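#struct-help
A.M.: can someone run this one for me? Single chain, 147 residues.
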Amino acid sequence: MIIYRDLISHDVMFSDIYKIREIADGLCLEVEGKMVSITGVDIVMNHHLQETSFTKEAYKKYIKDYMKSIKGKLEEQRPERVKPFMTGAAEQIKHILANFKNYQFFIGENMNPDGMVALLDYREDGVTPYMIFFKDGLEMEKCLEHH
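D.P.: on it. Structure tokens below:
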């Protein structure tokens, strides 16, 4: 199976046992979760994601830093992704800041402040949870029977 982990913090963000949608012209991965009850969201609960908070200004400071960290990672391993990421993320930041009050913030288990901040949101029904990750900020891992 496929486990996805934060390219910076190395924590597991989510696995392939969820409905994954690639949105924003391949910039982001939209993971659909279920509300489960202690109450919460399954993605958060079984991958031990930690909730964190941001002012509008702190998030701007943080995401500039995060963008340049990913930019440096991509130049080394996936150079073709630098421009798409830099353009897309800049446009995605504008969207996130536009509906800032709609999001909750989650980071990996180790709580590395330089790692990815996943965004929690609810569908049109206002009941279904889904989480947004930057695809370029994730590295894939594959697990198989071993003897």
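A.M.: thanks! The longest strand covers residues 129-134.
D.P.: also worth noting: The chain has one domain: 1-147.
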